[PDB]
Amino acid sequence: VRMNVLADALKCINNAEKRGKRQVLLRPCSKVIIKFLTVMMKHGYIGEFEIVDDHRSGKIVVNLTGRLNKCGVISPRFDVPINDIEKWTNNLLPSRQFGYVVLTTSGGIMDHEEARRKHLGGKILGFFF
């Protein structure tokens, strides 16, 4: 069915921005997705997200600036022992300056930049550039 729900929504976002389309209907929106999406907001990559209360599993409408080339999702969530943070950022990020790798860390779903400041590594959720 939808084993990882995360990727299904973020693919929808990519496909949408490939039309240029500012809006997407996301299904079936997780907590991990909400935390993924709040992380986007901070760096301005997407405009406002809104989670509708169906008594089912929650859908989201995305408003999109179009600043985003592409958003990818890591499953399996590979265990980062802090010094693979450096390797993972190099491979899939277009620049050393910019583009956030997204983790599920002990203290929250946080970007690798934020994770480095806290010194808390993790399991890898995602990539956003």
Binding site: R19, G20, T65, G66, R67
Partner: protein, 82 residues
């Protein structure tokens, strides 16, 4: 695109789309700018000062480019009830 002692190097900063925030890419010759002329309030009597909008080939080839002008123009507010 600044270098060391805040001078602006490379060579250019592209014209971005008023509707998609997307870069006009220099050999995308499928790209329109429309310049709609402002009117001297009361009626006709056209005086300069274009309200000018840039639209990418990507909007145009999806057949939506006419519609982008309608929202831009209403935002500048010459057009009403679009």
């Amino acid at each position: 695109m600044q270098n060391d002692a805040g001078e602006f190097v490379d060579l250019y900063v592209p014209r971005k789309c008023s509707a998609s925030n997307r870069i006009i890419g220099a050999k995308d010759h499928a790209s329109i700018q429309m310049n709609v002329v402002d009117v001297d309030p009361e009626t006709g009597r056209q005086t300069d000062g274009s309200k000018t909008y840039a639209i990418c080939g990507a909007i145009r080839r999806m057949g939506e480019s006419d519609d982008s002008i309608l929202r831009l123009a209403k935002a500048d507010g010459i057009v009403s009830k679009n």
